[PDB]
Amino acid sequence: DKLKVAVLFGGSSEERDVSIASGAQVIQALRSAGHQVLAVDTASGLLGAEEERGELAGVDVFFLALHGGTGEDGTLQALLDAGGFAYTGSGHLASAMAMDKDVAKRLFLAAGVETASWLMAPASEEEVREQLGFPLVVKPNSQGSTVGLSIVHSQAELQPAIELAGRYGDEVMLERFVAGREVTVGVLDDQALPVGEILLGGQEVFDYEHKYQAGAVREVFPADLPPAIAAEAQRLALKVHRALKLSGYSRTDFRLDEQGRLWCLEVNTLPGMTATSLLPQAAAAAGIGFAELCERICRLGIERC
């Protein structure tokens, strides 16, 4: 039968605007399926009639429409664990691991999932030149939505990029740049969804502004890939999902180089659920509408907790 769902969204991370967009979509979708939905901005509280345009007693599950920060890195998950509350997405350890890109890439390698060489800042000019080369990617260790990320083409560009990434967290990653195509794989309850490609044109990376403006980039589900490469991307994403002990759903990002080899960048335990977002498009390609997707995520969270 129908659920009472509290959709937690907003928060105080650099991905707050993305989270508000996700929360708005999920609230409408679950209401469309006849569930009772309570909208909670975790930076303010329970929204009234106008703001949407005690009561949480009897809530079956908290839908975590949050992105980044304490909402995605395990902190909120542990808070809800300690309160005995059911929630969607991955648990405390799994969420904390997937947000730490450094730790996650060590586990990718342990699972047989290819990933680009990297160093954590600070790194000397010698270490960078010997192990990484140019161009390279500087990114915060625990951000999302491409926040804080720079492409570094020469040694003189490195320090400003590290300082930029350092404004968004305590650790900074220097990663070998993988030239090629942009591929992403959603997982829903231990099943891979159709692979998607993001067509970047002349751009080096998939940045914040192109991730969340409608029509800024073309996104193709199922991607126009040789069947064996798409099957490999799905095989690897499931290995990542299982390796980090994720639950419910996830979305894994790959770079596909000009030689046909896939390189795993990261996995996201709370991927975007907006209109332009990648995971809903992969689900729709699999035949799963957005409302059904939201309900299934709810029930997977209930079963786990």
Ligand X SMILES: N[C@@H]1CON=C1OP(=O)(O)O
Annotated binding-site residue numbers for ATP: 131-184
Residues 226 to 255 in contact with Mg ion, rule: CB under 5 A: 253
Per the omega criterion (within 30 degrees of 0), is the bond before 227 cis? no
Residues that contact ligand X, how many (by CB under 6 A): 11
Helices 290-304 and 278-285 sit at what angle, rounded to 10 degrees?
100
Rounded to whole angstroms, the Cα distance separating 64 from 15 reads 13
- Kindly tell me which residue out of 15, 100, 197, 266 binds ligand ADP, with binding defined by CB under 6 A: 266
Taking phi over 0 as left and psi of -120 to 50 as alpha, with beta for the rest, 287 belongs to left
105 touches, from K ion, ligand ADP, Mg ion, none (C-beta below 5 to 8 Å by class): none
The one-letter code for the residue type at 64 is: L
Task: Name every residue whose Cβ is closer than 8 Å to that of residue 158 and which is 6 or more positions away in sequence.
Answer: 128, 138, 152, 174
Under the criterion CB under 8 A, does residue 114 sit at the interface with a second copy? no
87 in active site: no
Under the criterion CB under 8 A, does residue 239 sit at the interface with a second copy? no
117 in active site: no
CB of 110 to K ion, least distance (A): 17
295 in active site: no
48 in active site: no
Under the criterion CB under 8 A, does residue 214 sit at the interface with a second copy? no
CB of 115 closer than 8 Å to CB of 88 = no
Under the criterion CB under 6 A, does residue 72 sit at the interface with ligand ADP? no
CB of 55 to ligand X, least distance (A): 27
Residues 127 to 166 in contact with ligand X, rule: CB under 6 A: 144-146
Task: Name every residue whose Cβ is closer than 8 Å to that of residue 190 and which is 6 or more positions away in sequence.
Answer: 238, 241, 242
Helix (H) or strand (E) segment spanning residue 102: helix 101-110
Instruction: Reduce the DSSP state of residue 236 to 3 states and report it.
Output: helix
208 in active site: no
Rounded to whole angstroms, the Cα distance separating 303 from 296 reads 11
Taking phi over 0 as left and psi of -120 to 50 as alpha, with beta for the rest, 183 belongs to beta
The number of helices, as runs of H, and strands, as runs of E, in the chain is 12, 14
11 in active site: no
CB of 144 to K ion, least distance (A): 6
Under the criterion CB under 6 A, does residue 15 sit at the interface with ligand X? yes
- Kindly tell me which residue out of 56, 79, 216, 231 binds a second copy, with binding defined by CB under 8 A: 79
Under the criterion CB under 6 A, does residue 101 sit at the interface with ligand X? no
Residues known to be catalytic: 15, 145, 212, 251, 253, 266, 268, 272
Binding stretches for a second copy (CB under 8 A)? 70, 73-79, 81-82, 92-93, 96-97, 100, 103, 106-107, 109-110, 245
Binding stretches for ligand X (CB under 6 A)? 15, 18, 67, 144-146, 211, 253, 268, 271-272
